[PDB]
């Protein structure tokens, strides 16, 4: 089997991407944030505290003939941005882009933090990291990918995120029409439960490539590119008037600037992030200070190749017995 679904930016900045997901019988379609940095599939639901719901579409298990309470199971998750959610668990039929899993754990939120409530466009998350990170207790649950894997034509999924445009998540196949050149594969460590890999270096604009190992994660659920402070300083030093602002919470730059590209290494291959991808616009409405898309990972404890990096590439998440990542230009 295979599946193929379009993923759409939630706003003009590509802050996140939503993908429609069918849950239950008859189908209830919710728009979920596919997150390769976490391992829970959780939804706004008929159980979510009413004051914490503001515009989201909810899953109502009582209206699904295939829903079953997973008795005694609870979940609770905290993300890198300080957001959180928790609740109970149902199993139900879940389909993505025509690929169906029966018996998928659907984590129903009883509580969500303010950042979720305030984002009316995201109805929940679909985690695509390794199932070792799944938070269901007392019986850990599998991701949608891990449950689908054995049925797929190939044990893979691909992320093809757009810049200010829709893109695609495919399951079970490589679309050889969706990228240019060849795919470079690189080793993955699953020790922390992430798609963790090592970039071979970077360049700023037209500058020379610096060969240096950068360990980080491929995380579709993180907006920005978080890298070591040395790398980030070297990037922003090429932008007149850029500075790190403790009041704003990272590097800002004059909205009048033209940003340089940023290149990262994948083995001997190179992925180029155009400068425009690094502009996250005014820090507040009408400001002439703009927020940067490359930020320091110092204090986060891991480097994160978030959407800024991933949307410059066609990315293969190879879930074979020995997982690997692939990157191609597009
Ligand atoms: Na922000």
* Residue 203 alpha carbon to ligand 1 centre in Å: 25
* Residue 80 alpha carbon to ligand 1 centre in Å: 13
Separation of alpha carbons 11 and 27, rounded Å: 26
Domain boundary among 174, 199, 225: 174
- Same domain? For 90 and 191 the reply is no
- Same domain? For 63 and 184 the reply is no
* Residue 47 alpha carbon to ligand 1 centre in Å: 29
Over the chain, what HEC string results? CCEEEEEEECCCCCCCEEEEEEECCCCEEEEEEEECCCCCEEECECCCCHHHCCCCCCECHHHCCCCEEEEEEEEEEECCCCCEEEEEEEEEEEEECCEEEEEEEEEEEEEECHHHHHCCCCCEEEECCCHHHCCCECCCCCCHHHHHHHHCCCCEEEEECCCCCCEEEEECCCCCCCCCCCCEEEECECCCCCCEEEEEEEEECCCCCEEEEEEEEECCCCCCEEECHHHHHHHHCCCCCCEEECCCCEEEEECCCCCCCEEEEECCEEEEECHHHHEEEECCCCCCEEEECEEECCCCCCEEECHHHHCCCEEEEECCCCCEEEEECC
- Same domain? For 133 and 242 the reply is no
* Residue 97 alpha carbon to ligand 1 centre in Å: 30
Active site residues: 35, 199
Listed residue (196, 128, 125, 200) closest to 158, CA to CA: 128
Instruction: Characterize 79-88 residue by residue with b for buried, 16 or more Cβ atoms within 10 angstroms of its Cβ, and e for exposed.
Output: bbeebbbbbb
> What distance separates the 2 farthest-apart alpha carbons in the chain?
60
- Same domain? For 49 and 143 the reply is yes
* Residue 116 alpha carbon to ligand 1 centre in Å: 14
- Same domain? For 78 and 183 the reply is no
Listed residue (246, 228, 236) closest to 275, CA to CA: 236
* Residue 14 alpha carbon to ligand 1 centre in Å: 12
Q: Taking a C-beta distance cutoff of 8 angstroms, is the pair 59, 24 a contact? A: yes
Domain boundary among 134, 154, 174: 174
Separation of alpha carbons 268 and 265, rounded Å: 7
- Same domain? For 142 and 179 the reply is no
Domain boundary among 174, 207, 227: 174
Q: Number of structural domains, the chain?
A: 2
Structural domain including 10 reads 5-174
Residue for token pair 């944030």: 33
Long-range contacts of 118-121 (CB under 8 A, 24+ apart): 118/54, 119/10, 119/16, 120/54, 120/55, 120/56, 121/10, 121/11, 121/16, 121/18, 121/31, 121/55
Any idea how long the chain is?
330
CATH of the domain at 84: 2.40.70.10
Separation of alpha carbons 164 and 148, rounded Å: 30
Q: Under 8 Å CB-to-CB from 285, ≥6 apart: which residues?
A: none
């Amino acid at each position: 089997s295979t599946g193929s679904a379009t993923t759409t930016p939630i706003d003009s900045l590509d802050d996140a991407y939503i993908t429609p997901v069918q849950i239950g019988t008859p189908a209830q379609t919710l728009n979920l944030d596919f997150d390769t940095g976490s391992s829970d599939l959780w939804v706004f639901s008929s159980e979510t505290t009413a004051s914490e719901v503001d515009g989201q579409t909810i899953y109502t298990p009582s209206k699904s003939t295939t829903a079953k309470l997973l008795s005694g199971a609870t979940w609770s998750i905290s993300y890198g941005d300080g957001s959180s959610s928790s609740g109970d668990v149902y199993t139900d039929t879940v389909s993505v882009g025509g690929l169906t899993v029966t018996g998928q754990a659907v984590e129903s939120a009883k509580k969500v933090s303010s950042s979720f409530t305030e984002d009316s466009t995201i109805d929940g998350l679909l985690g695509l990291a390794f199932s070792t990170l799944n938070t269901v207790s007392p019986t850990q649950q599998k991701t949608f990918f891990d449950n689908a894997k054995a049925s797929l034509d190939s044990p893979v999924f691909t992320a093809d995120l757009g810049y200010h445009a829709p893109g695609t998540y495919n399951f079970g196949f490589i679309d050889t029409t969706a990228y240019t050149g060849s795919i470079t594969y690189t080793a993955v460590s699953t020790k922390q439960g992430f798609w963790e890999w090592t970039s071979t270096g970077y360049a700023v604009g037209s500058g020379t490539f610096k060969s240096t190992s950068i360990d980080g994660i491929a995380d579709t659920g993180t907006t920005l590119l978080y890298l070591p402070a040395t790398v980030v300083s070297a990037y922003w030093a090429q932008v007149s008037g850029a500075k790190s602002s403790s009041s704003v919470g990272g590097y800002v730059f004059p909205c009048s600037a033209t940003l340089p590209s940023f290149t990262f290494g994948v083995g001997s291959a190179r992925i180029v992030i155009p400068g425009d991808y690094i502009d996250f616009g005014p820090i507040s409405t009408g400001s002439s200070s703009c927020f940067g898309g490359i930020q320091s990972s110092a204090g986060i404890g891991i480097n994160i190749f978030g959407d800024v990096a991933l949307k410059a590439a066609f990315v293969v998440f190879n879930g074979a017995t020995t997982p690997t990542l692939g990157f191609a230009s597009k």
